[PDB]
Amino acid sequence: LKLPTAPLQLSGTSAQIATLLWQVAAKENQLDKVQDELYQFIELFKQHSELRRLATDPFVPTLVRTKIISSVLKDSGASEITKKLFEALADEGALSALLEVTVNYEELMLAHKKEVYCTVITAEPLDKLERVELTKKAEKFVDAGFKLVMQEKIDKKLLGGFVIEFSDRRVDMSTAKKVEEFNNFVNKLVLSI
């Protein structure tokens, strides 16, 4: 009667599908099994046209929607957690709800691994010492014993330094911001003096 606890809460009626999906698959310990199975359906929704007609056509009746999905979903290695899921979305026309339920299941899976994104922008590419001096200030800016990925990036307008685009937080140690804030502390003291 107990479900495995969701690592972070979400919004409703389109993303808590993924919260419920994570609460089912982690009970079956099928976590990285079914997550890239959602990816294949997106490639099925990308390349093939007959399946992606079924996710947006408003004229197909409510029995051809389920009798193609359960016809396509034989065993084939596919999980019955996944097979009972994709039956349910074509049961109530929710086959358009796939591209949202994945990216929050992506978020919830990266919430199960303690594994946060970032994107660091410099003016200079990072060598094998410059990148390993970066993380020791970056891991002051995560809250706990988390992981860290790297998405190194080049832009000329920053004059050295970095900006850690956590997508939730940002730390500006770039000098182009520093010379801007140096100029604002010039003007706030030359006008007052």
Binding site: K84, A88, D91, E92, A97
Partner: peptide, 29 residues
Amino acid sequence: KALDELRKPKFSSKYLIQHVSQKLIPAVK
């Protein structure tokens, strides 16, 4: 190209999560 119509959720039946939950727990062994 072929995923611009899939970019957002769209459905009827605002109580959809309660519908799918009874169709996700059966395959729980």
